[PDB]
Amino acid sequence: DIVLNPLGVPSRMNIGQILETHLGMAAKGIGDKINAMLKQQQEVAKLREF
Amino acid sequence: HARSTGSYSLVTQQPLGGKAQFGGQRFGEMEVWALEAYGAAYTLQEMLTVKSDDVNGRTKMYKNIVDGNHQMEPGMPESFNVLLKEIRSLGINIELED
């Protein structure tokens, strides 16, 4: 959805954006796993475990 | 924002300031230095007379531009007449010499 510029990270040391990027990628991965396990009808056991 | 020939101020016949009213961007004191550095005298002369304080030259330039003719006949900025009157309002006497 958006293509930023890498060179804006090292000169102005706001490394928090890259860590937020990685953490948001992990969060969206968890959300995608939940959405995949919820799209095909699966019982509450697998969802609760995950 | 952009501004062609529009509305002008009252005390000095300059274009208004701002986007709310139809106003033109200020050609500041630093930009005049940059125009002098290039040596562009005609550009500077049009910048401070014919699209600015001058009244008769401004209308003549407008007619020339919508006449097919790119030519300016500037007079004197009205902000200089304002300065002369404001100095003469004191005890000083400043005037032009033939």
């Binding site: - | 040596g39 005609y42 097919g68 003719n69 790119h70 030519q71």
Partner: protein, 79 residues
């Protein structure tokens, strides 16, 4: 049909007299009915004046002598 004018500056070497010469020529080509000596390519008068400068057949001396021979022809045309 014009990007930079370095060669035209080489033709008349002041870079300030070039502006005045091109202004005189372009004003003659715009207000006056005078015709360009090079084939115009849907360009403005200033670009054509600069290009005629770079073609070599125009300068301040040439403009003055052309204007003066036109003036003497005009004076003789009164009869």
């Amino acid at each position: 049909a014009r990007v930079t004018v370095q060669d035209a500056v080489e033709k008349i070497g002041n870079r300030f007299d070039l502006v005045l010469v091109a202004a005189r020529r372009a004003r003659q080509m715009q207000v006056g009915g005078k015709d360009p000596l090079v084939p115009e390519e849907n360009d403005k008068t200033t670009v054509i004046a600069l290009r005629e400068i770079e073609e070599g057949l125009i300068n301040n001396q040439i403009l003055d002598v052309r204007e003066r021979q036109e003036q003497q022809e005009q004076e003789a045309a009164e009869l």
